[PDB]
RNA sequence: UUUUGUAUAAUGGGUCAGCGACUUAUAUUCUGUAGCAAGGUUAACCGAAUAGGGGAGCCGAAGGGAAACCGAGUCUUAACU
RNA sequence: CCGACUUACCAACCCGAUGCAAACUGCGAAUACCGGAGAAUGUUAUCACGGGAGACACACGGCGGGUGCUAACGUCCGUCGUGAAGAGGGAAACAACCCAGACCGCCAGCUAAGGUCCCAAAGUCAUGGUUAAGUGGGAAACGAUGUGGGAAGGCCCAGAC
RNA sequence: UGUAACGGGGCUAAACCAUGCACCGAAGCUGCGGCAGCGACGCUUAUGCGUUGUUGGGUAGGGGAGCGUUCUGUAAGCCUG
RNA sequence: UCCUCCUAAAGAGUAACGGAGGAGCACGAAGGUUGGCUAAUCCUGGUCGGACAUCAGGAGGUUAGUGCAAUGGCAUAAGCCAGCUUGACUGCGAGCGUGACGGCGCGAGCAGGUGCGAAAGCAGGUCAUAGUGAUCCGGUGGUUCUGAAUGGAAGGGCCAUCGCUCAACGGAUAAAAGGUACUCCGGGGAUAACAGGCUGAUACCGCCCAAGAGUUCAUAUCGACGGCGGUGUUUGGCACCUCGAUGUCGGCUCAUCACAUCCUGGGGCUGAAGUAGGUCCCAAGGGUAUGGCUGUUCGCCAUUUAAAGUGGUACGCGAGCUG
RNA sequence: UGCCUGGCGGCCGUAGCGCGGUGGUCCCACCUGACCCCAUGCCGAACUCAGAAGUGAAACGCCGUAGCGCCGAUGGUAGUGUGGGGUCUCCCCAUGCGAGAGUAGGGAACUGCCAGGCAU
């Protein structure tokens, strides 16, 4: 279980960068989401690391 | 208004008041609603007459094949699992 | 005839070394594309049918290219973003650049881009060096004892310069 | 055409390359109140009585719900010197 | 109109008046099967015989060949020869690929009847990708499907098939050229010329090395073979503003700004003895001609001037004039 | 159980070339002859038949040799997906992927089944 938050917009981003946020459940700026720790979530975090921040 | 793009030095209007631009008939398809239901429904017309009669007639319940023709099967081909 | 020779010259095949090619690959990625399984999330976001449209004049920016002068806010193709159809802050002004997607109201607070001397809201903030040209605040080949450094080298107290 | 290649004043830093701590800075995010749609759930529906999550920029265009005027029936009713 | 490669950004596809080439056929064998075989080139030797015909070996290993243009493939050969034959058959077709669609292509396998091979097996056209044209209309053959009172038939219908460089090749008609400055309408700055805008291939100007010319000596003064920049001044590229009008070349009057200055002013070098000169730097305060020719700016000539500038202002200025 | 040989395979160069030796009990190859089965665009050269006198010369199988071919590291370089930048017809930073060429080096194949001859 890890905590993720979004800190940047998804306006000029790629479709694969917005679908990643859709999969992570992020809705807007500063949306705190709890997600299970798994290689899939880690890969998503690596993919959108420039706009997300983890609390661990 | 037209444009990728108008404060544009692209067009329109001096202002006010009145008038002014997806309507009508018939025919077909679709949606909702209402009656009836494997049936539904009349037109012309008669009728003192929005009643009633008139089911002539139209759609659908059975389709296949060009057509004869056959039939919940048919055509295709001498014959097709 | 046959030829004996060298000779201000050029040069085939092969060998050794150095390169080039969108229409050359004995080599060969990253990305992208097809399919399967799996956890999580997304208002089925997917497909099929039926009713109704609108549109087929796009532009700019990034990356990958052709034609141009490796010129054009030039033109032609692929991908993404924006405008078109998107308000707001910033770049002094600015359709396409950056941040960021306006349900409404509040004389509440927190931030991103971008800034904190005044216009104009915020540090005349602290330590550390550079610049003396208003460089900052438009530009090249090239030239110069301009300085701020780093690493070496020659000559040199029998005397260098 | 008139400074006119920092926006201007002005700056020997208020310029640049390096470190850090603060602040300003948007319709971005958080706080309060209010409206509407979709979907889950028990409302045994009153089709709404609480929840909860989410969404609500918008041209052409599509869908849905509505306001206003004339006349007609309700209406020999009602208001009105 | 159709075929091959690249551009085409390693799935497919993907444009330009982009770069390179082809097709509008041919074959009863150049098809199928069975059986067998492997060259291009070079070297050596040998009669006519030569660099190269034919014959022997050796090296080489597809560097040849594909009926054709290119690409992808071909040794089990798809290449090269011989024999036998017509599967260059009929009716079907699981399941796919590609297209907006019409449509096109690959196809295991089924029923009948064949060819080759002893047989297993192969053959529903050529190694593959171009060799092509919707519909209507009309013709031919066959067809027991129809046959307008009945029996026939004409005609029509199903199958095979024929006729179109419809080449503008998804084809508007069975058949079709030009002028308008006598002109006209709806429209476009979606699209033309002057002008304005972006860039600067061209134009002008500036700068760098120095081979040299310069009686010796590169740089008093010029400057090759080459290179780097500036103005947006010419001829030009794009077509972003304007076609429900921004009036255009030249001339007259009227000027203004700039300096890469024609004179005046000051200076450096000089292959500057002096006058008179050449080159370069600063400097825009002022001035900067009259006539013949031509509509002309430009330009030629005559004669002056201390000098008779370069360019911008919508190639300045027509709600100032001229035509 | 070993050695050698033949056939059918697996993989397709660390598997292939070249140099030097070895092998004939058996197998294999070379080899003898041909009216016949059969054939040569002529020819027992090839195919095929009847045989084993002779030979391991050639081919073939085996052995060792690095004159070639071949494989091939680690590290580094180019390139590149995503996000930021600069002096932007070209590069840099952060995080992942990571070549090719070349060097050191490896390397004279391995193996399955069915058969034949000699030892056991
Ligand atoms: Mg956990
Ligand atoms: Mg326009
Ligand atoms: Mg504006
Ligand atoms: Mg317009
Ligand atoms: Mg206007
Ligand atoms: Mg107009
Ligand atoms: Mg007007
Ligand atoms: Mg109805
Ligand atoms: Mg019927
Ligand atoms: Mg059936
Ligand atoms: Mg290439
Ligand atoms: Mg997938
Ligand atoms: Mg069109
Ligand atoms: Mg178009
Ligand atoms: Mg376009
Ligand atoms: Mg454009
Ligand atoms: Mg580009
Ligand atoms: Mg351009
Ligand atoms: Mg602009
Ligand atoms: Mg254009
Ligand atoms: Mg539009
Ligand atoms: Mg905006
Ligand atoms: Mg948007
Ligand atoms: Mg703004
Ligand atoms: Mg600006
Ligand atoms: Mg502003
Ligand atoms: Mg704050
Ligand atoms: Mg900040
Ligand atoms: Mg202040
Ligand atoms: Mg201070
Ligand atoms: Mg001035
Ligand atoms: Mg605010
Ligand atoms: Mg908000
Ligand atoms: Mg609230
Ligand atoms: Mg809305
Ligand atoms: Mg919103
Ligand atoms: Mg009434
Ligand atoms: Mg491709
Ligand atoms: Mg691709
Ligand atoms: Mg053939
Ligand atoms: Mg054969
Ligand atoms: Mg000869
Ligand atoms: Mg060829
Ligand atoms: Mg053949
Ligand atoms: Mg059969
Ligand atoms: Mg037979
Ligand atoms: Mg062919
Ligand atoms: Mg016709
Ligand atoms: Mg008759
Ligand atoms: Mg009959
Ligand atoms: Mg015809
Ligand atoms: Mg066509
Ligand atoms: Mg007109
Ligand atoms: Mg235009
Ligand atoms: Mg023009
Ligand atoms: Mg204009
Ligand atoms: Mg000389
Ligand atoms: Mg021009
Ligand atoms: Mg005009
Ligand atoms: Mg006008
Ligand atoms: Mg005019
Ligand atoms: Mg001067
Ligand atoms: Mg002055
Ligand atoms: Mg004075
Ligand atoms: Mg005279
Ligand atoms: Mg003029
Ligand atoms: Mg004039
Ligand atoms: Mg005027
Ligand atoms: Mg005249
Ligand atoms: Mg023997
Ligand atoms: Mg023999
Ligand atoms: Mg031997
Ligand atoms: Mg490596
Ligand atoms: Mg990048
Ligand atoms: Mg390597
Ligand atoms: Mg290597
Ligand atoms: Mg060997």
CA A13 / C1′ F89 distance in Å? 28
Distance CA A20, CA A41 (A): 10
* A28 sits within 7 Å of strand D by its CB: yes
> Nearest 5 degrees, angle CA A14-CA A19-CA A20?
95
Q: Which two tokens stand for residue A6?
A: 């979004």
Q: How far is the CA of A12 from the centre of ligand 11 (A)?
A: 34
**Residues A37, A47: contact at Cβ < 8 Å?**
no
**Residues A8, A26: contact at Cβ < 8 Å?**
no
Distance CA A17, CA A14 (A): 5
Q: CA A37, A10, A47, A19: dihedral to nearest 10 degrees?
A: 70
């Amino acid at each position: 279980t890890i905590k993720i938050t979004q800190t940047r917009s998804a306006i000029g981003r790629l479709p694969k960068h917005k679908a990643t946020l859709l999969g992570l459940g992020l809705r807007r700026i500063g949306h705190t989401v709890e997600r299970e720790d798994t290689p899939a979530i880690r890969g998503m975090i690596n993919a959108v690391s420039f706009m997300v921040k983890v609390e661990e």
